[PDB]
Each structure stands twice: as C-alpha cells, then as structure tokens.
Amino acid sequence: VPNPTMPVKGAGTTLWVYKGSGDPYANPLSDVDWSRLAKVKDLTPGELTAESYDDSYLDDEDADWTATGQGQKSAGDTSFTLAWMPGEQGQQALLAWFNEGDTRAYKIRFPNGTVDVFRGWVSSIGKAVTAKEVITRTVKVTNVGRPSMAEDRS
Amino acid sequence: VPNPTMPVKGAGTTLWVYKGSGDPYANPLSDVDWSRLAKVKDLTPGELTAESYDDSYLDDEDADWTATGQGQKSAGDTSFTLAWMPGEQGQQALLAWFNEGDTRAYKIRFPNGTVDVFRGWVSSIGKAVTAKEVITRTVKVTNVGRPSMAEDRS
Amino acid sequence: VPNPTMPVKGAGTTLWVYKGSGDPYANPLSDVDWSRLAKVKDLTPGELTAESYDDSYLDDEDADWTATGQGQKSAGDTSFTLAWMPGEQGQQALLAWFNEGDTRAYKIRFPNGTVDVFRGWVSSIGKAVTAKEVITRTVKVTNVGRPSMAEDRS
Amino acid sequence: VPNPTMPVKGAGTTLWVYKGSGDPYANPLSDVDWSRLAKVKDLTPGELTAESYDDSYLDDEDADWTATGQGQKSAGDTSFTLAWMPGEQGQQALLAWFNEGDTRAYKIRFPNGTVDVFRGWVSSIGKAVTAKEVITRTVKVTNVGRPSMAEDRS
Amino acid sequence: VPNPTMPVKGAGTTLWVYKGSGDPYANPLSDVDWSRLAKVKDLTPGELTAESYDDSYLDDEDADWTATGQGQKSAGDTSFTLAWMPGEQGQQALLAWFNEGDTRAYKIRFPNGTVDVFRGWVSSIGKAVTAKEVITRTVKVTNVGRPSMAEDRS
Amino acid sequence: VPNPTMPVKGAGTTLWVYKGSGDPYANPLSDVDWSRLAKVKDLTPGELTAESYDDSYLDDEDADWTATGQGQKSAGDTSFTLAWMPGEQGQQALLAWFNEGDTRAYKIRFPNGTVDVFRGWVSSIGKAVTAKEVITRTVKVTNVGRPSMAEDRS
Amino acid sequence: MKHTELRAAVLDALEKHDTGATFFDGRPAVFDEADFPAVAVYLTGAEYTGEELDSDTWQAELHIEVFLPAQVPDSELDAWMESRIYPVMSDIPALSDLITSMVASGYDYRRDDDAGLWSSADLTYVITYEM
Amino acid sequence: MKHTELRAAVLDALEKHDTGATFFDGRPAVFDEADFPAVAVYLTGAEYTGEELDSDTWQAELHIEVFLPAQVPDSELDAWMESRIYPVMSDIPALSDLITSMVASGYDYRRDDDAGLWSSADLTYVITYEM
Amino acid sequence: MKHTELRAAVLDALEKHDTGATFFDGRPAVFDEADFPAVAVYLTGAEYTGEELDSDTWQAELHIEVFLPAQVPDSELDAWMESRIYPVMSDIPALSDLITSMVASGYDYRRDDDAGLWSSADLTYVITYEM
Amino acid sequence: MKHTELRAAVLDALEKHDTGATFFDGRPAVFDEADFPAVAVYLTGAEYTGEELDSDTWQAELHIEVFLPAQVPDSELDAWMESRIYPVMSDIPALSDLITSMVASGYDYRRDDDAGLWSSADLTYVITYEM
Amino acid sequence: MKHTELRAAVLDALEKHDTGATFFDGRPAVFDEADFPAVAVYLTGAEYTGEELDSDTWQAELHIEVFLPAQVPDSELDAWMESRIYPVMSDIPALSDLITSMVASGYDYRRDDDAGLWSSADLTYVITYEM
Amino acid sequence: MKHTELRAAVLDALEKHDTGATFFDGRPAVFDEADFPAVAVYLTGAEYTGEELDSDTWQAELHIEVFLPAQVPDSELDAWMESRIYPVMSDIPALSDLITSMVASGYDYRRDDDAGLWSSADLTYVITYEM
C-alpha cells in the first residue's frame, strides 16, 4: 500500500506524456488522455534552482558579511534513457515533438502514489550502439514555466 | 555524557528549522517552536570564507613579498540530502520555503551538546531515483548575513 | 526476424556511403549504388541538439520562473573507427572525401530493419598504432542540414 | 636525539599560535607566551612561489630563447585540519582570530629540532560531519609578509 | 607477406628522417638517403582536422537546421618517444633539427607495405628519468603544409 | 662501463649547483667548484619547447592547408624533490638562492657519462609532512637563456 | 528490529497459502525423510550500515530455503521458487512496518552428491532496518 | 519467465535436427555407456539485475552441455560444439518471445582423469529476461 | 591505553546486570557443559593507524562472544545478542576516558557440526585508542 | 574458423622441418617412454570478444607443448623451445587466411616430482579469429 | 646494511633491561619447556624499493617474537608487548646510524591448538635502510 | 637472448671469485649432504613485454639460489647474499651485451621443516632482453 509519509523504493516509476486538450495541472491523477513511454532504462528528474541577487547599498552600516536574496527561479532539465523502438507510437511522438518546436507537458508517477508534473520542450536526442547490448535512446528535455510539484496536493 | 572538550562522533546529529516569532539567536538551546527534519542521509555544513584585500602603496620601502589583509567574510552554502517523504509537514514546509522567496533560520544540533545556528534562503531542490534505492530529496541552502557559531557561547 | 517494436541487440550494424547520382532520401532501403565500409570496430552516431531562445519581455506579469523556446536545431557529429586497410576502395574513397571538400550522404543500417540516413562532410581522420594490436583508422564526420531519421518512415 | 643534518620522520610535529606582546621572530625556540593547538589530524605548510618578470627589449641581439627574472615572491597558504573541540581555549581563539580580522603569528615545531615561523590571517573555517567518524574542523590560513624559514638560523 | 587489403598489427613499424637533396614525395618507397631512428618506444601519428565554415545568409528560406561547410584543413602534430642514446647520430641530428629552426620530412614505414610521409618542424624535446627504468627522450613534431598519405599511391 | 650509444638506466643520477667564478659551459665535465645536493627522491628535467609562428599572406595561391614556422624557443622548468636536511650547506644554499633574486647554473650528471647543464632562477619551495614518512623538500626552478644539452659535446 | 518479529511475520504470511510443508524457524533444522518438504527461514550476516546521521541503520540478508529429495527434477524446484515463494514475498503488509527497504537477490540451486539425501534451493533477500 | 518454458523452447528446436542423442531436461541426469552422447540443458546463477525502472529484470546463464566418452579425439568435440549446436542456437523463433537479450559466451572442454569415464564440453550463454 | 584496563572496564560494566553467566577475561577460556552460557572478551588485530601528527593512534577490534549449547534455537541467540549485550555496550562511562572512538560492527552466528558441542555468536567493535 | 583446419595448418607447417618427434593433434595424447618428444598442439579457453559491430569475433589460446624426460637438463629444453618452435611459428602462410591476429605469450617450464616421468614446456599464443 | 649489525644493535639494547629471558639471534631457534620465555629477532621479506635516485634503498620487516607457555592468560602477553618491548624499541641510539626510517606495525597473538605447547606473539616493524 | 649464453655468462663471472661451492646450471639439480652449498642459476617466467615497436622485447626473472643445511644460523645465509652473490652481480661486463636492463628484487629465505635437510635462499632479478 502506497504511503506518502514513509520512504519508498524507486522501482516501478512510470513516465507519461500529455496529449489532447485541457489543463495538465487540473487532474494530475488522471490517466485518461495520457500517452505512456515503455521501459525507461534510467530517469533523472530535473533539479530546481535559483540565482542569487545582491542586496547591498552604500549606506549600510555593516559590510563585513555578504547579504544576498533569492533571484529568478528556474526549473531544471530532465533527462531519461529508454530502449530504442522505432515502431511504437510513443517514440514517433517524441521525434515529432523534437522536429517541430513545441512545449508540451510530461508527468512522472512514483510508486509512492504522488504525481509530479512538468512542462517543457525537448533539447537533445541521441543513441548508443554497442556490440552486445540493447540499442538505447537518450532524451533530454528543457523545462519552462512553473512546475507543479508532487506535494502541492495534500 | 556530552563533553565539549573531548572529541565526538557525528552520529546522532539532528537538524531543525525555526518557525514562529522571536529572535532565533536568543536561545539556540531552546527546542520549543522549532520544526524538525527527519531521516537525513547526509549533511555538509557551510564553509566560511573571506576575500583578499590588497594593501600595497607605491610609497612602501619593500615590495619583494606580497601583503594582503582580510576582505569581506561570507557564510558558505549548506547542503543536505534526506529521504523523500512528501506526506510529512517538514518537506511541504521546505517546498513552501523554496517557491516563495524568504530567508529563515536553520539549526544544527550535534551530539556534543553545542548548537549551531545559521540564516539563509534555499537555492536548489533536487531528487534522485534509482531501481534499488530509496528516493532521496537533495537540498542546498545559501546562507545570508552573519552566522552564530557553536562556541560563541561559553 | 527483424521487428521494430521489440528491443534490438546492437550487433550486426553496418554502415554505407552513397556514391553515384540520385536523391539519397528517395529510398533509404535501397542497397544498389551504395558503397560499404567493412568491419568497423566502433560507431557512435551523432546527438541531435538545440539551443534555447529567450522569451522574455518587461511587460510580462511574472518573472519568477524563466521561459525559453526552442532555437536552432543541428545534427551532431558521427564518429566511427575501423580497421586500417590502405589498399581497399572504401578507405581510399574516405580519403578522397576528406581531401576534396564535399557534403555527401552516409547511412546506417541497423539489424532492427530500419535505416538511418545523414548528410555531412568529414572533419577528422586519425590513426592509432600499438605494439600488439591492429592498426586502426578513426574518422569523425560533421553532419550538415536536416537528417533523415529511421522513424520518419512507418 | 634530534639532528638537523639527517632525514627525519614526519611524526611528532606540533603547531603553536603566538598570543601576547613581543616580537615573534625574536626567539622562535621560545615556548613561553605561545598557545598550542591540540591533535591536528593533517598539516600541509604553504608553498612559497614567485612570478616571472619579462626581461626583453628590441635592442637585444638574439631573441630565440626567452629570458625572465624573478618577480614578486609571496608566502603560500597553510591548511590544517584538527579535531572539533568547541569547548577548548584554542579553537575559541581560532574563531576569534577569524571573526575579528587580524594578522598574527603561527609556528610549526618539527621533531628535527628546527622551528618554522609564519605570519598571516585566516581565510577559511570549515567542518566535516560523518556518520561514523570524528567531527573535524578544517582551517586555511593565508600568510602575509615575509616568512622566517627554519634554516635561517644556524 | 605484406598485403594492404587485410588488417595488420602495428608491430614492426619503423620511422625515418629524410636527409639529402631532392623531393621527398618522389619515391617514398626508397630507403637510400634516409636516416633512421632506432629503438622507438611509442608512436602516435598526427591527426588530420579541419574547421567549420558557416554558410548562412539571411535570404535563405529555412534556418531551423545549421549548415556548415569544410574550412581550412591542417595536418596534426606527431609525437613519439624513444630511448635516450646520445651517442647515435640520429639523436644529435634531432637536436640539430630543434636548435636550428627548420622544416624537414619524416616518414613512417608500416609492416603492411605502405609508406606514410609528412613534413614539419619540431616543437618539443623532453626527457623522463626514473629509478628503475630506461631514460627516454620524448619528441613532438608539428607538421606543416600538406601531407602525402599512405593510400594516395595505388 | 658507461656507453653513450647503448641505453642506460636512470639509477645513479646526481644533481649539482655551480659556485665560484668562471664559465659553467666551459668544462661541464669538471667536478671542482661544484656543490652537490644529496638524496634527491625525484627529478624531472624540464622540457624544451617552442611556439608556432603563422606564415600566411593574402597573395598565396594555396590556402587549404595551414603553414607555420618555428617561433621563439624556451627552456622549460625543472622540478625535483629531496629529503629535508635543514642542517646541510646545500639546502641553506638553496634558500639563499630563493630569498635573493639570482640566476645561477645547475648541472645534471647521468650514469651514462654525459653531462647536462642549465641556467635559471628558482620559483617554488615547498614541504610535505606525513605521519609515517620522511619530511621532503620540493623545489622548482625556472630556466633562462639557452641550455647546453648533453649532445652538444661529442 | 527484533529478528524474532521479522521471521515470525514472514512465516505467518507464508503459511496462509496451502503448501503442506514443515516450516522451520532459525538455523537449527533437523529432519528425516518423512517430513521432506521443509522450508527454513533465517537471517544472516548483519552489519552496521551507518547510512543516516539521525539514527542507527543495519543491513542483513533474509533467507528462504526449501529442501527436496535428491534426483527430483530441476523443473519441480523451479516451481517452488517461481510460483510459490516469489508472489507471496512481494507484498506482505506486516513487513512494511519493520523493514525500511527490501531488495531481491537471485535464488540458486545446490544438490548433495556425497550421500545424495537432499537437494535445496534458497532465495536471498537484502534487508535494511533500524535497531 | 518460467524456466520450464525456456528450456522446453530450447530443446524443441534443438531436437528437430537429427542428432540421435538422448536429451536431458533439467539438472539431474543419470546415464551409462549405452546411451552415451547426451545433451543436457539447464539454467544456473539467476540474479536480480535491477536494470530498468519500469519492470523487473533478471540475468541467468544458459548451459548446453554434451557428454562423450573419455579419450574421444578433441577434433570430434569441436564439431559437436560448432557445427551442430552453434548454428541452431543462434536463431530460435520461439525463443525471441520470452528472452529480451541473449549473448553468447565461450565454450570450454573438460575431461575426467579420476576414472576416465566421461568427457564433457558445455556452451554458455547469458540470458536477460523478465519475471 | 593498556589492554588490561579496557577489558576490565567492559567486564565491570557488563557484570552489573544480572545474567548468571561465567565471564572469561582474555583469549584462553576452557570450560565444559556445566558453565555453558560463558561470555569471553578479548582484543585482536591491533594496528598502527598513523592518523594524527600529534601523538600515537592505534586501531584494535573488541570482541564479545557468547557460547550456547548446540541445537539451541536461533531466536534464543538473537535475544542474547541484542537485548542483553547491545544496550549495555552503547554507553559505558568508564570507557569514554580511554577510548577516543568506538564504532559498532555486525554480529554473526557460528555453529559446530564436527561434534555438536557448542554454538557461539560474537559481537565485533572497532576501537581507536592511543598507546 | 573451425578449429580443426587451424591445428591442421600449424601441424603441417611444423612437420616439414625435420624434428623426429611424434605429433599429437588435439587434447587427448597417451604416450610411453619410447615416444618421448611428443609435441602436442591444442586450443583452449575460447571466448566471445564482441569487438566489432560487423561480424563475430572470438579469442582463443593456442598451445604448443613438448614433453621431454625428467632430469633432462634445462638448457636443452631452452634450445628446443626457442630454436625449433619459435622461428617456424612466426610466419606461416596458411595461418594468415584464417587468423586475423596472432600474438605471442611467454613459454613456461614445469617438471613432475610426484613420479619423475615427464617434464614439459608449452609456448602459449593468443588467437583472434572469426566464427 | 649488514643484517648482522642491525640484529646485534637491537639485541644489545634489548638485553640491558632485566628480563631474564633467553634471546635468540636469527631465524633458527630450538628450545624446550625449561628455558621457555624466549625472544627471537629476525628480518624477513627484504625488497628493492628504489625510492631515491641517488643511491640504493631497501625495505625489510623487523620481527620481535616472544614465546610463552600455552594456556597462559592473555594478560601476561599484553604486558610483554606493551610494557617491556614497546618502550625500549622506540628509541635506540645504535639504530639511528643504520636506519633511515623505522615505522611501527601492529602486533598480533597466536596460539597452538594442534598440541598446546607454545603461544607466541610478535611485534612487527618496517625498516627502510641503505645497502 | 639464448638463455644458455646468459646463464653461462653469469656462472663464469660468479665462479672466478673463490667460493668452493658446486654450481648447477639450470633447474635440474640433484645432490646430497657432501657437495652441499650448491649454488644454482636458472631463468623462469619468460613473457612477451611488447614494449617497443621496433623489435621484440621479453621479460624474464633471473634466479640465484644457494642451499645450506638446516639449523644453520640465519646470519650465515645473510653473509652469502650480502658479501658474495650481490657485489659480483652489480657489474658484469659480459651481461651488458645481452641484457638491455637488469633490475634487482628482494632476496628471501626458506627452511625445510618436513624433514630438515636443506635451507635455501634465492636472489631474484628481472631481465629485459631481445629475442
């Protein structure tokens, strides 16, 4: 039984791409109108970050210690790799996403029962060929806007 | 029995976040009005530093050896990683701290019996997913202003 | 039996170079009028990428989170190494390709049954000599224009 | 028995900090009016260096080979780590040294019988915490002015 | 028996330096008027390369994908190390080549039966000394002009 | 018996510093008026080098391949480490060499029977302290002018 | 935590399904041919992980091993490991309270040729808990 | 998935070619001089790979071992290992459904010097599947 | 410091709780079926750490081993190891004077099958002191 | 390719020079005092390299082993190993068709002290071919 | 340099302190129960380190082993190593001439269970000298 | 090159100094208590270095080993290695023509306790030559 208040294991995580019309943030728990990607061999979600803003004047009395405040936040870049399958609809959809410029929505569903949602455009598409291994497809997506985190919903 | 004179081991260190109204430096030994972060897997406290100020005039007799004095000190950045528990109040508090710009006070309580207090804002929120491992939340905090060290109190 | 849907194993990939007259994208499945490179020891196909276009105006309501759009895509660089055979037609063709600047077409045929087509000019030709190992020829190709992926055809 | 004319084994080195009034270089062999730091876990003394002064004109007969002369020498930075003892006098003295910017004198006493003296201000104070290890305090000192080497006295 | 159209292993490669008067490219298979360097411990022939030339006008219809053509080719740098034998005429010739600025022709003779000829000047002369190893002389040559490859002859 | 023709082993190399009046290059085989350093634990003689000079005009017919000629040569930097013996005259001489700006001459005598001579000023002086090892002194010398190589004499 | 509780929980969740086999708790397991289907559960090789600063963490390996007579076809042994033991051990509500993380490890077969009286097959797990 | 299915799928397509050899399914195999050229197939050393996030992955090593009388010439064993087994084992149409990846590993020879009753030679494969 | 006082301190702090067991100080320990629940304490594998420049540091492993009759149930050893030895061993006021650092390490069970007369289980610690 | 013709080629090129010794093709070789020199040739330890994408590659070690009576002087074994076997094995026109790469490896001596009936010395090669 | 000088220099200053024990110089040492407290010094495992270019350097391990009757309590052995041998071995004026560097290594205990006649414990050192 | 020449050169340069000891060339060496010192020289473990592109290079270990009766004091063996075998091997004019590089390695002692008839000590060298 999934429990948001206890640690889980990463196994079982699935990746989804929104296709259709509507608001992706409205019902992230929905599974209708959501394409799915099969057998992701690795998945590293993007790292949220922000840059420092200097808060210092000439009139300030104390200047021994620096003082900075949060500046402009930005969602990171999400990169995952998955088995190369030119026949499936999901990967043809991925290359359609890359070839024509667009910012779509993708979603991550942990075994914990919470759901993480992002919006962005894809930036890189690569392969990996080896004599005795499965051909893999490597994808990197650059996020835009404000992500809807997993625990915004309680 | 805690003993400041003798060396200790790092096992048993706990981290706290100040919530409420008052002066965080007034009673760092206080444990009331202090939220706690549970299940921390790593903790590297920030490293203090300073810049070099050049003290050299052309009127000086000797210039064979450089002469520099301390410049502007600055508290470092504190980073810790902890198990992903989206149901707990502490991590929802962390993400609330991140999305809206603010600077608060966090505290480190060693088993030695001394207490370390900083002030800063959060700069990064990351996550790590693995097939056979617990999902971990990685946090980085950029300190602001002047810290209150452990042995400022005697 | 080749099947695009199922995962494939990397063994069996072959590389071809277009020579002659026609349109390289007209029939990638064709094997006539296509030279072949024999016994490559490694093959890393290029990694498609794109650069960010900043989408920011001072009139916007919120500037907390960055917003960018896809910029100028570009095919990557393809690098492969193969056994040094100075007397063969294919490698003399490679050196003619390098010395006389041209943007020809090369093709990768996976065992999966799909075919990948690129266009570019060669940027590096190198060699590796060892006391107890086969002399090898290392090649790097810089792609140009818009490539023809294997999944455009269905 | 210590002997400066023979190789020595590094074990047994102790470090001292001058406190009080007088001239630090007057008697480096003195042990009165010198505080001591307890059980340093590592100690890497600074590396003296200098920069090149270009000695070139257009009137010189030959310019095939470069010609440079010594420029501005400078003492290095001394870094040592030692066990965290927040209650002891020496480490409170270290933090007083860092917070109120001053340039003092520190000394290294080798088992060989020679004594090394430096002068500088502290540039970094750091800490390291581990699950099953002793909490350590890491210090970096930036030297200033002219050092007094061990073999200046014979 | 040497055969160009088969893989070969690099054992038996010999390096030669042209001394005398004539055209080095006239008969690279010749061994008369060609000094020889003995006891070479490593040999990495130079890597050919080229620069990218941007071919983009604002009048073009499409600018989604970058378009670049070959720029300026250049032979690489060839480096080899060989045992320190100050008595041999070859190494005295090498140091004469270095001290007195000049560009000459050097040649590589593979066991395969083909011959590779370059032209360039020397850029580095190093040495390596070890307690239990043979003193080695390390040389680096910067090619100049156009090389004459192995399979330019058929 | 030393033989310049045959390769030698690195063991037995000794390092010398010239003191007195005369020409160091006159009799490098001399051992009178030459101080000696004792127990060098490592010795890496500096590598000679030169920088490229562009040789290209607008009137040149061929511009596909780059053309460069040798520029300004320069001797390298020689670095050695040796056991710390503050009582010996040689190391007091080294520190006298560093403290006051000067360019002296140092010489390397291989077991092969040849002698290598350099001229330069010292740039770095450091130590290395370890609980279970000999205190070592690290020296780095920056060469000037034209070195007299071991193969200039035959 | 207390190894008694963990083994008790595993055996409780493993007994509910019909197997008709004697179940042994702990290393000492003495049996003749009459009670041949025999399943023994034990913990081995505990260590101090030292993973988290907050509280203690330990690592131990959980073993489920079944005994079947020699010369039984390998196919039959395959069945116990892949049809009976694997589905029950994936989800057990009782374990989730005590164990922070459970990870599978490969099962393996061994036969006795000195005397030819038994042929076992154990399934290995890795347990991370708090003591 | 079920090791029974995989061994059956291998043996079915290994039997259609005429070899005139007794085939043993599974590890236990007992014979004598009369029925001697005997080919046994078994799976050993299963392990949890944990390669992909989506679902389970396991690695097991597939074995095809052939037993021939001692003092048989070596060249005869070469033929059994290359000509008969290696071509058939490359492409099994019924295999591709169950196995995601099958990688060859070298075969090796061993003889019995204790008593001189048997000489075997097994081909080893690496199987990656889903359970 | 000297190993004698360290073992004396640990045995003193371990005897206060009632256990009704015979405690052996040092490596040699000879007994029979009468005084079976014996507990022996010894130090082994001392080494020169060479950690700090100031003064000498050494590492040694501290063992606490308890002997129980063969065929005693496993769960009994579990309790003896955890419930009795672990709580007392965590905090001992006398130790902190001598030992600069004390780290736990896993306990392990060993049984005897050659003759079936004993079955022990020793908890291991790592000690860093100054000599 | 097939191991048979490779050993055939080596033995053919090795027999032309007069040596006056029996040659054994393949691993099994049974001999007595009269047939003392012996000179057996065999292949061992084949593996799948997977170096090139185009086609299959394998590695195997080629052994040439010579038997001489016990208590024969060491220098004789040397003279035999180098002078006879090394020059012929360097260049063989027949091998170059089959073997893509042949690399030497050191020879080694071994004597029998259990009974003192034989002393051998084998030269080892590494072969990279295509199957 | 000359191992005889080094062992003599150790034993001379190891003998001045009153111990009343037979001292053996070199590896061969034969005794019985009468003259039992016996301390033997030997050098083992010499090796060419080649640390410096100027002159030859070697590493050897110095051993000081003491033999005590079997079933002696561990307390007595601790005493010889920590009270009698460690303080004397730290500073020897004679060794200062011959030894460039001498680093301690941990001592260890061992007992004889085959026959129960002896129990020894050797302190180990690492010696770096010039030859 | 030819191992015969190298061993011959070493033995020639080693015999000129008076030693009064039987010298054995090559590994086979049989003797009894009369002709005891019995210095034996042999080469072992030849291998293909593959260091230089120009020509072949090999690595082999040169052994000089002396046999002395058991229970002979350690210091006397020390003498043979330090005062006899070592000084002669530093500079030998004959070797310099054949060997490109000769590097020392530590000598080591060994005694026979199965029967107590011999006690040897070999000095190891590393040889890099051309073949």
Author numbering:
A (entry chain I), B (entry chain J), C (entry chain H), D (entry chain K), E (entry chain G), F (entry chain L): 3 to 156
G (entry chain D), H (entry chain C), I (entry chain E), J (entry chain B), K (entry chain F), L (entry chain A): 1 to 131
From the paper:
The gpFII structure comprises 4 domains: an N-terminal α-helix (residues 4–24), a β-sandwich (residues 25–41 and 63–107), a β-hairpin (residues 46–62) inserted in the β-sandwich, and a C-terminal loop (residues 108–117). A comparison of our gpFII structure with the NMR structure of gpFII monomer in solution revealed that the structure of gpFII monomer in solution undergoes notable conformational changes to reach the assembled state. The tail tube connects with the neck via interaction between the ring of the stopper protein gpFII and that of the tail terminal protein gpU. All 131 residues of gpU comprise an antiparallel five-strand β-sheet flanked by 2 α-helices, with an O-shaped loop (O-loop, residues 25–37) inserted between β1 and β2 and an extended-loop (E-loop, residues 45–58) inserted between β2 and β3. To adapt to ring–ring interactions, the long loop (residues 46–62) observed in the structure of gpFII monomer in solution becomes a β-hairpin, which inserts into the inner surface of the gpU ring and interacts with the O-loop of gpU through β-sheet augmentation. The E-loop of gpU provides an attachment site for the major tail protein gpV through electrostatic interactions. The surface of the gpU ring is strongly negatively charged, probably facilitating the correct positioning of the packaged DNA.
The temperate phage lambda, which infects the bacterium Escherichia coli, belongs to Siphoviridae. The tail, which comprises the tail tube and tail tip, connects with the head through the neck. The neck–tail complex comprises a channel formed by stacked 12-fold and hexameric rings and a 3-fold symmetrical tip.
